[PDB]
Ligand binder design. Structure first.
Ligand SMILES: [Mn+2]
Ligand SMILES: [Mn+2]
Lengths: 349, 349
């Protein structure tokens, strides 16, 4: 099914006749336009149109699978007004600002604007082979850089300087760090929040490296924890439990498995190994045009995995004031199982 | 006048009794909380309260000048509901999403939510001496790194690699690049949009370096253009005109000068030197907790400069397919003139 033919039944069930697409990732998903922060798409009974300004004329002509109307706001949605006369027009309420909604309300007085909240969650969950290729390229770059920087992770090095080395190499390759890099050593390993600080890595520390590459618009995501010297027996048990949990959750991936059941599998396992109050609250997420997108792997999730989806699996266990471990891989759901896309070594500790 | 005593008359003129502050920069401005993406402030007849969650308990106690209520949304604004009973409550319509507004509407059924659009524009335009100090520190870091990277800008070097060197050094210093770095050589100098590409700098090129440092939450911003080898006579005339324009606009800065009149001064000057259809459409902007904030120096601006404001002055002239020049300095308005905060050399060409 085409992307448009995936989207239209969703709009029907949501009770709207049209959709103003404003989230850059969904503008790009639908049209192929790669400067999507400066584009908008109207999906309507008349078809679908990409709105962008004249700076982008040639680019949009080359990239867009949709016809273009070339102008600046407010001419864009004013031109669109006659198309949505008398229609229920959905909009992305978790993206659109109130001021932007007011602008549309003024332009479309004979339309009914309908807020869509969770409606388009996981719209992009299943990737095409072209999209998978782009994600593989991003993850391959991530793996290359991780492999290059790994030996520099040793006693005497600041967390921050490890992060700088990773960033430098991703950028030089024509990519970028996908999100604020995490390099968490020793007690900093217990904060899932923290990013690379000036703390100096020391003998005995575990070091958690949480990183992804953005390349050609697509993201990757993985997490590794490594030992510098010999860790405490406690931290070794924690590492071994998190790795056991990760590999077990990954091994249950297949079309039809419920995301919540994956989360439960990880929870139960960590609980069996004495870490059932120390663990992260979501097992993982979709990855694509955004680092964090549908599906969601939490206990309450109603998501069901299907072939073509790309997700993370990331159990974590944190011991406040002591240390913590996260291990994460990027997984493609296949027709009868899974394929791990993130190839960097997972070491013993 | 305190920040609260600056804000309350503005709210009065805007016809509201209260304000839900959601823009991170204004949350931080008002409270001093530095993880302001995860804080919200209610300004009300009862006073002002910072809302944030328990991860931030100690930090908020240490940083906030305002009392704290500790919880996650929606408990935060539900707890706030009784405070705004029967009140007109302003909200930042250019920040708040429609979904977030719906959440507030449900929580506050006995309140009237009032959209504020341009209302708080330039709220933070005048900086305190502490804020000025933070901006000086950011700009000093920018100048240091620029001075360090400048000699590497030569024939054979990719624009991208110059950008990487700048980023590396800012990060290692405990700061960050304030915005996507621009290193624009040769014809790339004619695109004000473009960022550092893989283009190799060559003899004869001008190179425009547009950069700032974010450090401790505060931003800096400057732009330099340099010659690699000997430029064409045309590009030299363009450079000399832009520098002439920049220094002239800067020399007119004082309390009471209209931002629009500064823009006109630059326009007229470029026009006199045959570049009056080649120039940028805004002369500059405020800088602070954001790279781009009030005031605005465009022809239509109603802004009037006052002591304590920090702005950029950046004339530009672009010759499509050939090249272009931008030169920009960061300026503090003083009681009887100005002080240039950006100290990197401006070279001859
Ligand atoms: Mn990760
Ligand atoms: Mn600049």
């Amino acid at each position: 099914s085409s992307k448009m033919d995936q989207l239209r039944p969703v709009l029907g069930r949501a009770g709207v006749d049209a959709l103003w697409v404003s989230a850059p990732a969904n503008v790009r998903w639908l049209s192929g336009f790669t400067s999507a922060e400066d584009g908008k798409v109207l999906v309507s009974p008349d078809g679908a149109t990409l709105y962008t300004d004249a700076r982008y004329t040639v680019q949009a002509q080359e990239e867009s699978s949709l016809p273009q109307y070339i102008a600046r706001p407010p001419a864009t949605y004013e031109h669109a007004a006659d198309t949505v006369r008398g229609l229920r027009v959905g909009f992305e309420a978790e993206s659109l600002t109130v001021a932007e909604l007011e602008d549309l309300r003024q332009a479309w007085p004979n339309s009914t604007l309908v807020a869509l909240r969770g409606t388009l969650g996981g719209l992009r969950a299943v990737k095409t082979p072209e999209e998978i290729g782009a994600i593989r390229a991003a993850q391959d770059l991530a793996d290359r850089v991780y492999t290059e920087v790994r030996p520099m992770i040793r006693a005497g090095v600041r967390e921050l300087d490890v992060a700088v080395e990773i960033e430098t190499r991703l950028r030089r390759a024509g990519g970028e760090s996908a999100f604020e890099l995490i390099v968490a050593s020793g007690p900093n390993g217990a904060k899932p929040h923290g990013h690379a600080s000036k703390r100096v890595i020391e003998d005995g520390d575990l070091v958690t490296i949480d990183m992804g590459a953005r390349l050609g618009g697509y993201n990757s995501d993985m997490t590794r924890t490594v030992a510098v010297g010999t860790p405490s027996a406690e931290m070794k048990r924690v590492y071994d439990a998190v790795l056991e949990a990760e590999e077990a959750a990954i091994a249950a991936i297949r079309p039809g498995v419920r995301a919540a059941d994956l989360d439960k599998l990880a929870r139960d396992l960590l609980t069996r190994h004495g870490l059932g109050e120390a663990f992260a609250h979501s097992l993982g997420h979709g990855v694509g045009l955004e680092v964090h997108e549908g599906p969601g792997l939490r206990g309450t999730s109603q998501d069901v995995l299907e072939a073509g989806m790309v997700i993370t699996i990331e159990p974590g266990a944190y011991l406040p004031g002591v240390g913590g471990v996260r291990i994460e891989d990027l997984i493609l759901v296949t027709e009868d199982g899974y394929e791990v896309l993130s190839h960097s070594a997972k070491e013993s500790v």
